[PDB]
C-alpha cells in the first residue's frame with residue numbers, strides 16, 4: 688500500500704531527507720548525471736530500457752541524457768516539497784509510477800536506484816543513515832509499481 | 833532553432849519571468865487553476881486528458897492534482913535554466929517529445945498562453961508579464 692509506505696516517513700526520516708537534499712539538490716545537473724551514470728555502470732542490464740537517450744556512455748556530453756537527468760532531479764524535488772502532505776505526495780508518486788509502469792519497470796528493478804543514491808550521498812559525506820532515509824522514500828514509489 | 837529561441841530571451845524578459853514565478857509559490861493551487869482554466873476556455877482539449885478521468889472534479893481529482901503539481905515543476909525547471917541556453921534547450925526538448933508523442937502541435941501548445949495570462953492577472957501581473965511568458969512558451973513551440 689502506497690499509503691502505508693508514506694506513513695513510514697516519520698519526523699526523523701523527513702528531516703534527514705531535507706538535510707541531505709539541501710546539498711545534493713544544489714547541483715541537479717551534476718548529481719543527476721552522476722546518479723544515472725552510476726546506475727548504468729553498476730547495473731548494465733538496465734541500459735536497454737533507455738534506448739531513447741542514445742549512447743549513455745557519453746555521460747554529460749549526451750544532450751538527451753543531461754535533459755533526462757536534470758528532469759529526474761526535479762521529480763525528487765517534487766517529492767521533498769510534498770513531504771508535509773501525504774495526500775499530495777501520494778498523487779505525485781502515482782503520476783511518476785505510471786510513467787514507469789508503461790516502461791515495464793517493476794518495483795524490484797526500480798529499487799536498483801538505491802545503490803547509486805547511496806554512492807552519490809557517500810561522495811558528499813552522507814552515510815548509511817541518509818542512504819536508508821532515501822530508501823524509504825524510494826519505497827513509496829515501489830509500492831505503487 | 834530552439835537554441836535561437838532560447839538565446840533570444842533578454843535580461844529584462846528573464847527578470848520578469850523570475851519575478852512573476854516567485855509568486856510558483858503555490859504550485860498545487862496555481863497548477864490546478866491553470867489546467868481548469870484551459871479546460872474552461874478550450875473545451876476541445878479535454879479529450880487529450882482522458883487518463884486523468886473527470887477533470888471537472890478539480891482539486892478533488894487526485895490524478896489531475898498530481899498532473900498539475902508536476903506541470904509546475906516543469907516550469908520550475910525551465911526558470912532555473914534561463915541563464916544557460918544549452919541546458920534550457922535539452923530540458924525543453926525532453927518535454928517537447930512528451931507532447932509530440934501525444935500529437936500536440938505547436939499551435940495547440942500555444943493555447944496555454946490564455947490560461948497563463950489569466951493566472952498572472954489574478955496576482956496582478958499585467959500584459960508585460962504575459963508577453964514574457966509567451967516568449968518562454970515560444971521556445972517550446974520551436975521544438976514542436
Ligand code: HEM
Pocket residue numbers: 733736737738739740755758759762763783786787790792796797798799800825930
Ligand atoms: C529515484 C528514482 C527514480 C526517479 C525519481 C525517476 C524519475 C523519472 C522521470 C521524471 C522520468 C521521465 C518521465 C517521462 O517523461 O516519461 C523517468 C523516465 C524513465 N525512467 Fe525513471 N526514475 C527513477 C528510477 C528509475 C530506474 C531505477 C529505472 C530503471 C531500472 C527507471 C527507468 C526509466 C525509464 C525507462 C524512463 C524512460 C526514459 C526515456 O525513454 O525517456 N527509472 N524516470
Ligand code: HEM
Pocket residue numbers: 786877880881882883884899902903906907927930931934936940941942943944969
Ligand atoms: C506551459 C505549458 C505546458 C507545460 C509546461 C506542460 C507540461 C506537461 C508535463 C510535465 C506533462 C507530463 C509528461 C509525461 O509525464 O509524459 C504533460 C502531459 C501532457 N500534456 Fe502538457 N504541458 C503544457 C501545455 C500543454 C497543452 C496546452 C496541451 C494541450 C493542448 C498539453 C497536452 C498534454 C497531454 C495530452 C499530456 C498527457 C497527459 C496524461 O495523459 O497524463 N500540454 N504536460
